[PDB]
């Protein structure tokens, strides 16, 4: 019920929130990196399968490719946007 | 001071809401990426299986596996929905 | 506008923040699980393709199959869950 107690709790709240921001940023960066690796490998093996198909026909099957660039960029943008969610209290 | 404490409380709420929105967006794009991954991986598993089948009717130990991420994608959508309940509306203060 | 309302709002804010942190930890858990499932299926279909290429080459030098290792990213997601555990707010009397 004291102004001092309220002020201390407020600083605690802001500091814990700010601490969470950095951790969530790292998790977003690791998720984007994992998606990039997945795209690389899936497309490489799709290309191997396609090459195998046509090299076997040199002597019906639809291979598909993956594009996750937009989602990965949205994750990077979230990282930069969260940079702007930090709390800077007055006083 | 009472004034400044209240302004800080509202700043805290606004920053928190903006972070929640950005995190919801990130979760949406992760679920969308996961769905695309499932579609493409299963389509190429089908292609490999069809190649095996057409090769054996012209070995039977080649095992193709398929992916089901739909429980995880639904959990990401649920997280979005639940974070929607964590918003603090200024009228709540 | 009144210190008692400020105190109540402070408790409301802290509880919504803690609940959001829990939801975010859950989303990270389900993302790590989806990533592990993806690695399993992608590598199993890679090995299936490689086995097919070898059995046809013993029946193709240019065909390269690659494998996926997401272990660093998955450990970093588990790490984010663990660190976020230290971000909870314990207000007191």
Author numbering:
A (entry chain C): 911 to 969, 1004 to 1035
B (entry chain A): 912 to 969, 1002 to 1036
C (entry chain B): 911 to 969, 1002 to 1035
Describing publication, verbatim:
The first involves insertion of the fusion peptide into cellular membrane, followed by HR1-trimer formation by trimeric heptad repeat 1 (HR1), which expose three hydrophobic grooves on their surface that then interact with the trimeric heptad repeat 2 (HR2) domains to form a six-helix bundle (6-HB). This 6-HB formation brings viral and cellular membranes into close proximity and is crucial for viral fusion and entry into the host cell. Previously, we have reported that OC43-HR2-derived peptide, EK1, and its lipopeptide, EK1C4, as pan-CoVs fusion inhibitors, target the HR1 regions of S proteins of multiple HCoVs and effectively inhibit their infection.
To investigate the inhibitory mechanism of the EK1 peptides, we crystallized EK1 in complex with the HR1 motif of the SARS-CoV-2 S2 subunit, which were tandem linked through a 6-residue linker (L6: SGGRGG). EK1 binds to HR1-trimer mainly through hydrophobic forces, including two flexible loop areas and a middle α-helix. Compared with the 6-HB structure of SARS-CoV-2, EK1 showed enhanced interactions in several local regions. Y30 on EK1 can bind to backbone nitrogen atoms of G932, and also the side chain of Q935 on HR1 together with E27 on EK1, while the E21 residue on EK1 could bind to both K25 and K18 residues through strong salt bridges. However, in SARS-CoV-2, K18 of EK1 turns back to bind E21 on EK1 to form a new salt bridge to stabilize EK1.
